[PDB]
Design an enzyme around this catalytic site. Structure first.
Site, PDB file in Angstrom:
ATOM      1  N   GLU A  99       8.933  -5.731  12.568  1.00  0.00           N
ATOM      2  CA  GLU A  99       8.978  -6.349  13.867  1.00  0.00           C
ATOM      3  C   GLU A  99       8.064  -7.560  14.038  1.00  0.00           C
ATOM      4  OE1 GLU A  99       8.333  -2.283  15.273  1.00  0.00           O
ATOM      5  OE2 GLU A  99       9.772  -2.796  16.852  1.00  0.00           O
TER       6      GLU A  99
HETATM    7  N1  PCD Z   1       3.817  -4.849   3.322  1.00  0.00           N
HETATM    8  C1  PCD Z   1       5.146  -4.625   3.277  1.00  0.00           C
HETATM    9  C2  PCD Z   1       5.749  -4.094   4.462  1.00  0.00           C
HETATM   10  C3  PCD Z   1       7.027  -3.805   4.375  1.00  0.00           C
HETATM   11  N2  PCD Z   1       7.757  -4.005   3.220  1.00  0.00           N
HETATM   12  C4  PCD Z   1       9.168  -3.600   3.195  1.00  0.00           C
HETATM   13  O1  PCD Z   1       9.775  -4.185   4.320  1.00  0.00           O
HETATM   14  C5  PCD Z   1      10.728  -3.236   4.919  1.00  0.00           C
HETATM   15  C6  PCD Z   1      10.341  -2.964   6.335  1.00  0.00           C
HETATM   16  O2  PCD Z   1       9.177  -2.090   6.341  1.00  0.00           O
HETATM   17  P1  PCD Z   1       8.517  -1.578   7.699  1.00  0.00           P
HETATM   18  O3  PCD Z   1       7.913  -2.745   8.431  1.00  0.00           O
HETATM   19  O4  PCD Z   1       7.628  -0.458   7.353  1.00  0.00           O
HETATM   20  O5  PCD Z   1       9.766  -1.121   8.587  1.00  0.00           O
HETATM   21  P2  PCD Z   1      10.610   0.248   8.613  1.00  0.00           P
HETATM   22  O6  PCD Z   1       9.879   1.238   9.456  1.00  0.00           O
HETATM   23  O7  PCD Z   1      11.039   0.597   7.257  1.00  0.00           O
HETATM   24  O8  PCD Z   1      11.937  -0.313   9.303  1.00  0.00           O
HETATM   25  C7  PCD Z   1      12.068  -0.453  10.718  1.00  0.00           C
HETATM   26  C8  PCD Z   1      12.164  -1.894  11.200  1.00  0.00           C
HETATM   27  O9  PCD Z   1      13.139  -2.568  10.401  1.00  0.00           O
HETATM   28  C9  PCD Z   1      13.481  -3.831  11.020  1.00  0.00           C
HETATM   29  N3  PCD Z   1      14.205  -4.595  10.037  1.00  0.00           N
HETATM   30  C10 PCD Z   1      15.544  -4.566   9.940  1.00  0.00           C
HETATM   31  N4  PCD Z   1      16.118  -5.254   8.925  1.00  0.00           N
HETATM   32  C11 PCD Z   1      17.375  -5.182   8.757  1.00  0.00           C
HETATM   33  N5  PCD Z   1      18.029  -5.725   7.729  1.00  0.00           N
HETATM   34  N6  PCD Z   1      18.206  -4.488   9.602  1.00  0.00           N
HETATM   35  C12 PCD Z   1      17.699  -3.830  10.752  1.00  0.00           C
HETATM   36  O10 PCD Z   1      18.535  -3.251  11.520  1.00  0.00           O
HETATM   37  C13 PCD Z   1      16.289  -3.854  10.874  1.00  0.00           C
HETATM   38  N7  PCD Z   1      15.668  -3.170  11.972  1.00  0.00           N
HETATM   39  C14 PCD Z   1      14.296  -3.577  12.267  1.00  0.00           C
HETATM   40  C15 PCD Z   1      13.516  -2.591  13.112  1.00  0.00           C
HETATM   41  S1  PCD Z   1      13.999  -2.573  14.798  1.00  0.00           S
HETATM   42 MO1  PCD Z   1      12.712  -0.833  15.899  1.00  0.00          MO
HETATM   43  O11 PCD Z   1      13.781   0.680  15.586  1.00  0.00           O
HETATM   44  O12 PCD Z   1      13.226  -1.583  17.438  1.00  0.00           O
HETATM   45  O13 PCD Z   1      10.929  -0.288  16.493  1.00  0.00           O
HETATM   46  S2  PCD Z   1      11.434  -1.062  13.753  1.00  0.00           S
HETATM   47  C16 PCD Z   1      12.452  -1.909  12.634  1.00  0.00           C
HETATM   48  C17 PCD Z   1      10.732  -2.037   4.000  1.00  0.00           C
HETATM   49  O14 PCD Z   1      11.804  -2.273   3.027  1.00  0.00           O
HETATM   50  C18 PCD Z   1       9.392  -2.077   3.347  1.00  0.00           C
HETATM   51  O15 PCD Z   1       9.351  -1.419   2.110  1.00  0.00           O
HETATM   52  C19 PCD Z   1       7.176  -4.487   2.089  1.00  0.00           C
HETATM   53  O16 PCD Z   1       7.782  -4.703   1.064  1.00  0.00           O
HETATM   54  N8  PCD Z   1       5.816  -4.766   2.132  1.00  0.00           N
HETATM   55  O1  LIG Z   2      11.034   0.375  17.166  1.00  0.00           O
HETATM   56  C1  LIG Z   2      11.459   1.185  17.969  1.00  0.00           C
HETATM   57  C2  LIG Z   2      10.552   2.168  18.603  1.00  0.00           C
HETATM   58  C3  LIG Z   2      11.044   3.058  19.547  1.00  0.00           C
HETATM   59  C4  LIG Z   2      10.200   3.987  20.141  1.00  0.00           C
HETATM   60  C5  LIG Z   2       8.857   4.037  19.786  1.00  0.00           C
HETATM   61  C6  LIG Z   2       8.358   3.151  18.844  1.00  0.00           C
HETATM   62  C7  LIG Z   2       9.202   2.218  18.258  1.00  0.00           C
END
Ligand code: PCD
Ligand SMILES: O=Cc1ccccc1
Ligand code: PCD
Ligand SMILES: O=Cc1ccccc1
Ligand SMILES: O=Cc1ccccc1
Ligand SMILES: O=Cc1ccccc1
Ligand code: FES
Ligand code: FES
Ligand code: FES
Ligand code: FES
Ligand SMILES: [Cl-]
Ligand SMILES: [Cl-]
Ligand SMILES: [Cl-]
Ligand SMILES: [Cl-]
Ligand SMILES: [Mg+2]
Ligand SMILES: [Mg+2]
Ligand SMILES: [Mg+2]
Ligand SMILES: [Mg+2]
Ligand SMILES: [Mg+2]
Ligand SMILES: [Mg+2]
Ligand SMILES: [Mg+2]
Ligand SMILES: [Mg+2]
EC number: 1.2.99.7
Lengths: 907, 907
Positions: free
Chosen positions: B869
Site C-alpha cells: 500500500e
Molecule cells: N520488502 C518487501 C516487501 C514486500 N515484497 C513483496 O511484495 C509483495 C507485497 O507484500 P506485502 O506488502 O507484505 O503485501 P501483502 O500483505 O502480501 O499483500 C497485500 C497488498 O497487496 C497489494 N498489492 C496488490 N498487487 C496486485 N497485483 N494485485 C492486488 O490486488 C494487490 N492488492 C494490494 C493490497 S490492497 Mo488491502 O487488502 O486494501 O489493506 S493490502 C494489499 C509480496 O509479493 C512480497 O513478498 C518484497 O519483495 N519485499
Molecule cells: O488492507 C485492507 C485492510 C482491511 C482491514 C484492516 C486492515 C487492512
C-alpha cells in the site's frame, strides 16, 4: 464433489470432479481432451487408453476416486502434437497404422506405456501387451501397428536416427505406387481429427442431445406412446414421434428391382403402426445432455401388441408364414441364373458330382466407433446432416421424401469416421437427426452406444446355400447348380441386389459353362441387411470354395491343382457369361505353389497328437464398381496460392479416400510437376462436391480415380501454354480463363444382369486373388489358431502401398473372425465386442503375407483395380479348408466355434 | 447454425457455431481455450485479445459471422506453452509482467500482433499499440510490460540471444533481493492458470450456474418475491431466497469496536426485510448455464416500497435523518485523537495557521477479472467455497453463523485471482454460493459481470475532511486539528477501523506534538465500504499532504524544505504517540532534492502559454500489519523427494504471495543449501493451511515472512546432524523424527489505539516514502497529463525486486487514476471501465522512477517492511500539488476532472 490437484500432459490441473465420474468423461468433457477416444464404453477396446501413474488404463472404466492427488496422467495430446510428433506418432504415419484412425491414440498411448517399461520389446512382447491392454483395431489387422512400435523403439533406443521415421521421396518423384503417407495421418495420430462424438462435445450450448426410445421386442403392432413422465425429467426439451415427421416417414430403397414384390418403401423413419425388429426407433427424446436424454427415454411408455417373430430366413420363408409387411410376401425377390445347357443331364452323366449345404451368418461390422450423427437448420434454410454416411448423395435421395424436404433443401456431409465396413451404405441415424432438427429448429446430436451399434445398425445378411458341381475325372468342371436364401431382416434396401450377387459370384474364378440356380430374398424380424465388406461374395464364395475342396477330395486331387485346372484363361467366361478382363489366376497359383507345398510339409512336421496343423486354399473374385455403367465426377481446381484442390465426394470409411485422391491426382498432374503436398482433397458434401458416388463395391479407386485422372488431364489442357509449359494462376485469371475444371468417367462397357437369366457384364474391372491359410487345431478343445495367412493379389497397379497393404491385412483379420468367432444371432449376448467374437490381436497371426501379381486393367486408372473387398471374398473358406486339411472335419455352417469343431471331431 | 472450417493455433478446426455467437465464448467454451481471458465483456480491457487474420481483435466483441471460412486465429495457447515458450512469454517472466496474470495472455497476443507488423518498435510505438488495442492492466503500471516487449523484440530481431531472456542466478546463489521470477509466472503467461471463471467451465455437468436477482433501487422495504415465471424458464432448477438460509442470514463484522453503536450484524446474506443499496442480492436463480440463469433472473418480481435514500455521508449524518438500520444511529462510530496539549490556544498564538476542506471519493477497485466464486458439498459433508477471498480464515468466521454452519464444517479456499486491491478483504459472493450449495446439494458457480463488479462489490469509502495546521515562521509544526466523516455505505464491516486510520495517518510523517481531532463513521445507501489499497491513508494523507503545501505557500517556503524541517527524526513521535522504528525521511528527501530542483527547472523551461508544467511533492507512511500484536504461522516440511513445502495461507491477490514465500524461505534455508526451485508454496485453504491471516494492511511479508523464517529455522534445527551437516528425509524417517515443523511469530511490541485518545503503538513496522509528480496542464481544456512519477521508498530490505518494483508501479498508476479520473458516484455511468475513468496506458507515464533508500527494520524478516500500500498512500497529493505548482489552482475534491480544473482556472 472433490478437488483433485493432478498433472495432465505435464501441466498441473486444479480439478473439480465427482468421485464416481469416469475419467474418460472428465478428460473429454471437462478438459476438452477429445484425443481420448471412446468406443465401447465397457473396457473392451482400448480406444480410451491413458497413462495413469505409469500404468496404461482404460479411462472409460476408471472412476475419479481411483485418481489420487498428485497423479500423473498422459493422453495422446501429451505424447505429441502436430508440430512436435513423438517417435511413435511418426512411426504410425510412416507405417500406415492410421486407417480410420479411431484406435490410433489409444494404441500410441498404450505403446508409450509398453516402451516405458520394456525399451526393446520383441514383436511377441508388443502383441502380448496389446492383448493385455485390450487395444482393438478393426481396420489394420494389427501387423502395421506392431511394425510401427518396433521402428519407434529402435529410434528411442538410439539404434537408428529419428529422420528415418520421415518418408523419403522416391528418386523419380513418383508417389503413385509408393508408401507416401496419407494426409489425414498426422491429425489421427495426434487426436486432432474430430469424429462425430468429438464434434458433439464442441457444438454450442443450444444443441439438443438425442436418445432413442427403442423396441424391446422383435415384432409388434404399436398401439400408443406415452411421453408424459419423460417430459417432466431433468433437462428434457421434448419427445419426437412419427407425428412430427413432415414427409412420408419412410426410407426408399431407391433402386428396388422391378421384379421385387415389394415397393421399396417398407422402412419407417420412426415406427408408426409396427415394430419390425428389436431396436427399432419409436421416439426421440431431446435433452440438454446425452445422459439426461437417455434417462428420460427409459421412462417413455410404448403400448404394443407383440406378434410372433420370424428370426431366420427359413422360418419367414415357410409357405404359411404371416406377412411381416402386410400385402407383400415375405419372400419378396428371386434371381435366377441360367447359363448354357440344362444341368440335370450333365450331372446325370458326369464322372463325379459333389453337393453341399452351407451357411454364413449375420456378421456384425464392429467398427471401434459406434454410430453418431448430427443435424441443424442452416442460416440458408436448408437442413444439414453430418454423419458416417459413405454415400452422401445416395442417402440424400433415400431420405428426402421421408423427412419431407426437396433435395435442394437438404445437405449431407460425411464426418471423419471410425470405420464402417459397409454398414454405412445404409442410412442409420440421418433421418432421425433430420426429423429432430426440423421439428425443434435447433441443432441436434445423436450418439449410439455400442449395444445400439450392435443391435440397431444393419448386418451382413445370412445365406442358407446349397451348391453342386459336376466334373470330369480330370477335374474339369462341367456344370453347377445353386440355391440360396438371403435373410435380409425387415428392411428391403439393396436386398434384391445382394441376392443377385449370388448369381454373379457363386463359383466365380472358374470356367463353368452350364449353370442353373436361384436366389431368393426373404424379410425377417432379425436385424436388417446392410452391406458388409464383400457384399454377397463372402457367402457365395464360402459355398463354392469349400465345395471345390470337396470336389478335389472326391477326385483324389490336390485342391490347388484342381483350381489351376479350372481357373479363368482366355476364352473363358464368368458365371454371368462375361469374359474376364485380365487372366491372373494361373500366374498367382503358379507363384503360390511352392509356398503351399512348403506349408504342407511344415504342417506335417510340426503336427502333434493333440495339435493338428493344416493348410487351406481358396480363390476370391469381386467387382470394382456398382453394377452396369457406373460413373463418377471430379473437379480439379488451381487455387490462387498455387495449390490444387481435387473436389470429389469420395467417402472415407478410413480406407484412404484422402491418399487415393492425392496419389491419383499426383500421377495425372506429373506433366505440370505438382508436389503431392500441394494437392488437396475435399470432405464429401452434397452441396459443394460432385456426385462421385458411394464408397461401396470397391469402386472409388476405379470410378472416382478415373474421374480425378480425367479432371486433372483437363486442368493440364486448361493450363497449357502455347509453345510449351504451363500458365500460372495469375496468368490464367488475367486472361479471364477458367481455373476449376470438370472431369467425368463412365464404365461404358458394362451392362446390368438380366432379370430372367442373370447374364450380363455387370463390372468392367474385377479384383482377383488366391488365399492360403495355415492353422492349428487343438483336437481336445476344438480351438483353431490361425498361424498364417497369405494373399496373392492382382490389383492392377497400386495407387499407394501403405493403403493396399493395410486394406488386405484388415480384410484377412475380418476373415479370421468370420471363420472362427463372429456372429450376431443372440440380441443381447452378441451386443458387446467380446460377446460377438471380435478378433483381438492374438487371434490374428503376425504372419500376414501379401504377394502382388498385378495385371494392369484396361479400364482402370493407370491400370488399377479396387482392393477394398478382395481380402474378405473367401479367406474364411481357406481357413475352413485348412481345418479340414488338419483334422478331417468340415465345418459347413460358420463360425467354427470350438464346441462345434469338437462335436465334429468326436462324431 | 453454420459450419466453419478455420485454423486455430495452427490446427484445422471443423467448427459448428451460431453466427451470432461471440468468438470469446466459442474459443473458451466450445474449444476449451480458457487462455482467452474475459473480464469486461464490452471491448474495453483487451484481456480477450486474439489474432484473427493478422489483426488483434477483442474476441468478446467479435461475432462468428466476422470469421470467414479459412480464417487463422491465434490465442495464447498458440503463442507458446510451458515447455515451449515464445520470446514474449520468456520476457514477461523475466521482467515480472505477470502479477495477477489476468491481462498477460491478452497483452502477449497483442504484442505478437505488434511485432508481426513492426519488428523494431520504439517504447512509444509499444504504448500507442496497447492504447489502440485497449490492453488494460491494473497491477503493473504498464512499464514492465513495455520492458518485456522491447526485450523480446531484440531477441526476435537477432540483436541478442534468446538465452538472455532466462534468469541468471546471482553468483552467491542468493535469491533474496534478486529478480528471481515468480513461480506462477509460466502458468500465467501461457494461459494455463485457471481463475474462477475458467474453473467454472471445467466443472462437471451437474454444476448449477447462479444469477443474482438484485435491487434496482437504493433503499426499500421488501414486501415479497414472486419466482413463478422464472421457474418456468429454460434450464431453471430453482430460486433461492432468504427462506433457504439455514443460519442467521447475516454477515458479522467480527471485530466491531465496543464503542460502535451498532452490533456488527447489519449486513444480510440475502435481503429479507430491506434493500440497503442498489445491487443488493435478493435471490439467486440456479440454472444449467449462466446465460439461462441470467435470463430467468430478469423475470423474478420483487415487490417493494421504495424509501428515500441517503447517497452521501453528509446527507445520512444530518441530525434528523431517518435510521437506515432502525435502532442504530446512522453515525454509528466516533474516534477521537487527543495528543499533547489543547490546540486552541496554540492556534491562537501561532505565527501561521492554515485550514482546508478536502474530499476523496468512492474509488472503484477495477480489477480486470470481475468477482467469481463457487461452492459444493464435499464427500466429507463439509461445504467448500472457492473464491477471490484474500482472508480465508477471516471470511470463514464472518459467514459461518449466517449460513448456519459450525466452523469445522466449512472450508474456504482462495482461487488464483485477477486482482482485488482490497475489495476482497470483504465477503462478496462466498455466503451466496454457500447458501446455494447447501440448499441444492449440488455444486454451484456464480460469476459477476463487470457492471456487478462495479455496482455490487465494496468501494473505497469517501471522506469529507477538514484539517488545520499551526506553525512557527521557520516552518516548525506546533499543532493540528482534524475532522473527518467516513461514508461507509450500509454495511459496517471494518468501518470503525477505517475511521481510526484517520487518527493514525492524518499528518503522518512529521513531529506534531499537539493534536485534537475526531473521525465519524456514517451508514449511507451508497456502496458499502471495502478496503481499497491504502485503507484510510489515501484519504488522510491527501488532506495533510495538500495542507503541507498550503502551509509552505503561506510561509513562502519551498514545500520539500518544509517537509525536511518537520520529518521524523529520533525523539519524535507519530500521531498516536509512538516512536518511529527507523528514520529514513530526511535521507530520502536529501537524495530527492537535486532531482526535484532539476524537475522544477525543466518545468519552467518547457512550459508554454497553453501547456503549463509543474512539480509536486508528498510524503507517504503506512503500517505493515493489522493493528496490535498481529501474528502469523507457517509449517516447513521436508518432503520425501527432497523438496520443501512451506505451508501458509498467504493469499495472493497477484502481488506475489508465491515469490514472497519462496524468497523468504530460500534465505532462511541457506545454511542447508536449498535451491529455490525445490521450495513449494501452498494455495490458501482453511482446512489444510495455518491461519497466516489476511493479505491486508501490507502485512504478509512482515508477519507471514517472519513466520516462514521461524518455521524454516526450526526445520534446520530438526535436520541438523550431530557433528555438522544435515540429515536427509530418509535418515529422519528411519529415526522416526519429525519432518513437518511449525513456526509462529507475533508483533509483540504493538498495542491497539485507545478508544478515548487514539494513542497507541498499532504497528511495529511502517513503510515510508517520498513522491514527486511531474505534470502538464492544458489551460484551455483543464486536462492534466502526468509526465513522470518518482517514489523514494524505504522497504527495509527487498525480498524480490521484480515484486517490489511492480507493486510500486501499480500503486503509482492507481494514484494517477485517483487524482485525475476515477470515481464511483453515478451507479450506471461509472459501471464500466471507461465510464469510471480507468487508466489506460497513455494516462500512465513511461517515466516511473523508484529509488530504494532501505533502512532495515528491527522487527522485519531480514529487515523487510511491507510494500503493497505504500505507493498509494499519497501519490495523488503529489499530483494535485503539481497541478497547483503548474497553474496556481488547487483541487480540494478529487478527482481533478478537466471541467473542474477549467472552472478553477477561470474563476
Ligand atoms: N520488502 C518487501 C516487501 C514486500 N515484497 C513483496 O511484495 C509483495 C507485497 O507484500 P506485502 O506488502 O507484505 O503485501 P501483502 O500483505 O502480501 O499483500 C497485500 C497488498 O497487496 C497489494 N498489492 C496488490 N498487487 C496486485 N497485483 N494485485 C492486488 O490486488 C494487490 N492488492 C494490494 C493490497 S490492497 Mo488491502 O487488502 O486494501 O489493506 S493490502 C494489499 C509480496 O509479493 C512480497 O513478498 C518484497 O519483495 N519485499
Ligand atoms: O488492507 C485492507 C485492510 C482491511 C482491514 C484492516 C486492515 C487492512
Ligand atoms: N489399386 C489400388 C486400389 C485401391 N487403393 C486404395 O485402397 C483404398 C480402397 O480403394 P477401393 O477398393 O477403391 O475402395 P473404396 O471404394 O474407396 O472404399 C470402399 C471399401 O473400403 C473397405 N475398406 C475399409 N477400410 C477401412 N479402414 N475401414 C472401412 O470401414 C472399410 N470399408 C470397406 C468397404 S465395405 Mo462395402 O460399403 O460393404 O461394398 S466397399 C468398402 C483407397 O484408399 C484406394 O486409393 C490403392 O492404393 N490402389
Ligand atoms: O449411387 C448410389 C448407388 C447405390 C446402389 C446402387 C447403385 C447406385
Ligand atoms: O459395398 C457395398 C455395396 C452396397 C450396395 C451395392 C454395391 C456395394
Ligand atoms: O485476521 C483477520 C483480521 C481482520 C481484520 C482485523 C483484524 C484481523
Ligand atoms: S475400452 Fe474404453 S471406450 Fe472401449
Ligand atoms: S485404424 Fe484401428 S480401428 Fe480403424
Ligand atoms: S475487451 Fe473483451 S473481455 Fe474486456
Ligand atoms: S497483471 Fe495485469 S491486470 Fe493483473
Ligand atoms: Cl457345420
Ligand atoms: Cl464354443
Ligand atoms: Cl475542488
Ligand atoms: Cl470533465
Ligand atoms: Mg521428440
Ligand atoms: Mg407401400
Ligand atoms: Mg477349356
Ligand atoms: Mg447360438
Ligand atoms: Mg521459439
Ligand atoms: Mg442487531
Ligand atoms: Mg524537535
Ligand atoms: Mg458527477
Amino acid at each position: 464433489m472433490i478437488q483433485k490437484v493432478i498433472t495432465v500432459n505435464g501441466i498441473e490441473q486444479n480439478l473439480f470432479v465427482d468421485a464416481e465420474a469416469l475419467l474418460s468423461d472428465v478428460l473429454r468433457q471437462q478438459l476438452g481432451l477429445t484425443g481420448v477416444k471412446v468406443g465401447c464404453e465397457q473396457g473392451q477396446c482400448g480406444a480410451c487408453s491413458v497413462i495413469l501413474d505409469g500404468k496404461v488404463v482404460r479411462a472409460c472404466v476408471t472412476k475419479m476416486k481411483r485418481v489420487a492427488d498428485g497423479a500423473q496422467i498422459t493422453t495422446i495430446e501429451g505424447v505429441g502434437q502436430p508440430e512436435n510428433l513423438h517417435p511413435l506418432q511418426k512411426a504410425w504415419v510412416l507405417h500406415g497404422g492410421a486407417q480410420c484412425g479411431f484406435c490410433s491414440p489409444g494404441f500410441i498411448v498404450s505403446a508409450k506405456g509398453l516402451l516405458d517399461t520394456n525399451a526393446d520389446p520383441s514383436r511377441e512382447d508388443v502383441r502380448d501387451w496389446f492383448q493385455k491392454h485390450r487395444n482393438a483395431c478393426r481396420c489394420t489387422g494389427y501387423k502395421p501397428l506392431v511394425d510401427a512400435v518396433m521402428d519407434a523403439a529402435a529410434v528411442i533406443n538410439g539404434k537408428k536416427p529419428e529422420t528415418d521415421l520421415e518418408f523419403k521421396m522416391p528418386a523419380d518423384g513418383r508417389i503413385w505406387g509408393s508408401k507416401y503417407p496419407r494426409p489425414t495421418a498426422v491429425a489421427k495420430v495426434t487426436g486432432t481429427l474430430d469424429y462425430g462424438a468429438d464434434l458433439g462435445l464442441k457444438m454450442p450450448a443450444g444443441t439438443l442431445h438425442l436418445a432413442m426410445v427403442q423396441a424391446k421386442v422383435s415384432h409388434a403392432n404399436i398401439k400408443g406412446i406415452d411421453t408424459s413422465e419423460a417430459l417432466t425429467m431433468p433437462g428434457v426439451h421434448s419427445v419426437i414421434t412419427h407425428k412430427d415427421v413432415k414427409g412420408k416417414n419412410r426410407i426408399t430403397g431407391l433402386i428396388t428391382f422391378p421384379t421385387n414384390k415389394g415397393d421399396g418403401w417398407d422402412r419407417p423413419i420412426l415406427c408408426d403402426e409396427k415394430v419390425f425388429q428389436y431396436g427399432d426407433c419409436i421416439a426421440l427424446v431431446c435433452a440438454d445432455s446425452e445422459a439426461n436424454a437417455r434417462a428420460a427415454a427409459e421412462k417413455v411408455k410404448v403400448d404394443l401388441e407383440e406378434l410372433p417373430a420370424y428370426m431366420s430366413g427359413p422360418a419367414a420363408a415357410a409357405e404359411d408364414a404371416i406377412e411381416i409387411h402386410p400385402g407383400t410376401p415375405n419372400v419378396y425377390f428371386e434371381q435366377p441364373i441360367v447359363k448354357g445347357e440344362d444341368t440335370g443331364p450333365i450331372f446325370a452323366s458326369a464322372d463325379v458330382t459333389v453337393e453341399g449345404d452351407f451357411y454364413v451368418g449375420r456378421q456384425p461390422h464392429m467398427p471401434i466407433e459406434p454410430d453418431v450423427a448430427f443435424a441443424y437448420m442452416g442460416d440458408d434454410g436448408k437442413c444439414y446432416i453430418h454423419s458416417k454416411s459413405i454415400g452422401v448423395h445416395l442417402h440424400l435421395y433415400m431420405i428426402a421424401p421421408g423427412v419431407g424436404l426437396e433435395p435442394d433443401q437438404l445437405v449431407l456431409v460425411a464426418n471423419p469416421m471410425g470405420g464402417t465396413f459397409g454398414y454405412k451404405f445404409s442410412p442409420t441415424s440421418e433421418a432421425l437427426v433430420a426429423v429432430a432438427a426440423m421439428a425443434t429448429g435447433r441443432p441436434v446430436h445423436l450418439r449410439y452406444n455400442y449395444q445400439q451399434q450392435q443391435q440397431y445398425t444393419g448386418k451382413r445378411s445370412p445365406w442358407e446355400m446349397n451348391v453342386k458341381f459336376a466334373a470330369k475325372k480330370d477335374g474339369t468342371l462341367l456344370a453347377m447348380e445353386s440355391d440360396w436364401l438371403v435373410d435380409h431382416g425387415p428392411y428391403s434396401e439393396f436386398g434384391d441386389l445382394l441376392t443377385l450377387r449370388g448369381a454373379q459370384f457363386i463359383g466365380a474364378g472358374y470356367n463353368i459353362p452350364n449353370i442353373r440356380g436361384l436366389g431368393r430374398t426373404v424379410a425377417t424380424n432379425h436385424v436388417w441387411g446392410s452391406a458388409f465388406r464383400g457384399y454377397g461374395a463372402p457367402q457365395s464364395m464360402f459355398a463354392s470354395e469349400c465345395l471345390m475342396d470337396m470336389l478335389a477330395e472326391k477326385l483324389g486331387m490336390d485342391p490347388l491343382e484342381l483350381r489351376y485346372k479350372n481357373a479363368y484363361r482366355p476364352g473363358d467366361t464368368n458365371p454371368t457369361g462375361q469374359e474376364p478382363e485380365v487372366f491372373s489366376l494361373p500366374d498367382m497359383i503358379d507363384q503360390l505353389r511352392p509356398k503351399y507345398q512348403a506349408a504342407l510339409e511344415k504342417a506335417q512336421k510340426e503336427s502333434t497328437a493333440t495339435h493338428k496343423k493344416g493348410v487351406g486354399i481358396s480363390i476370391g473374385v469381386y467387382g470394382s464398381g456398382l453394377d452396369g455403367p457406373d460413373a463418377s465426377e471430379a473437379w480439379a481446381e488451381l487455387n490462387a496460392d498455387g495449390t490444387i484442390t481435387v473436389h470429389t465426394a469420395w467417402e472415407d470409411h478410413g480406407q484412404g479416400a484422402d491418399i487415393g485422391c492425392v496419389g491419383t491426382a499426383h500421377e495425372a498432374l506429373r506433366p505440370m510437376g505438382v508436389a503431392p503436398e500441394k494437392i488437396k482433397f475435399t470432405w464429401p458434401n452434397t452441396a459443394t462436391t460432385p456426385n462421385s458416388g458411394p464408397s461401396g463395391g470397391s469402386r472409388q479407386q476405379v470410378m472416382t480415380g478415373n474421374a480425378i485422372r480425367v479432371a486433372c488431364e483437363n486442368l493440364l489442357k486448361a493450363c497449357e501454354k502455347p509453345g510449351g509449359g504451363y500458365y500460372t494462376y495469375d496468368e490464367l485469371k488475367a486472361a479471364d480463363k477458367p481455373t476449376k475444371i470438370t472431369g467425368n468417367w463412365t464404365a461404358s462397357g458394362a451392362t446390368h444382369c438380366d432379370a430372367v437369366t442373370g447374364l450380363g457384364k455387370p463390372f468392367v474391372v474385377y479384383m482377383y486373388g488366391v488365399f492360403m491359410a495355415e492353422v492349428t487345431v487343438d483336437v481336445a478343445t476344438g480351438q483353431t489358431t490361425v498361424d498364417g495367412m497369405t494373399l496373392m493379389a492382382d490389383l492392377g497397379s497400386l495407387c499407394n502401398q501403405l493403403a493396399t497393404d493395410g486394406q488386405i491385412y484388415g480384410g484377412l483379420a475380418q476373415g479370421i473372425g468370420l471363420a472362427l468367432s463372429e456372429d450376431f444371432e443372440d440380441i443381447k449376448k452378441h451386443a458387446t465386442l467380446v460377446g460377438a467374437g471380435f478378433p483381438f490381436i492374438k487371434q490374428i497371426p503376425d504372419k500376414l503375407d501379401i504377394v502382388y501379381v498385378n495385371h494392369p486393367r484396361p479400364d482402370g486408372p493407370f491400370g488399377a483395380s479396387g482392393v477394398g473387398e478382395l481380402p474378405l471374398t473367401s479367406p474364411h473358406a481357406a481357413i475352413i479348408n485348412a481345418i479340414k486339411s488338419a483334422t478331417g472335419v468340415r465345418i459347413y455352417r460358420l463360425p467354427a466355434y470350438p464346441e462345434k469343431v469338437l462335436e465334429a471331431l468326436k462324431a
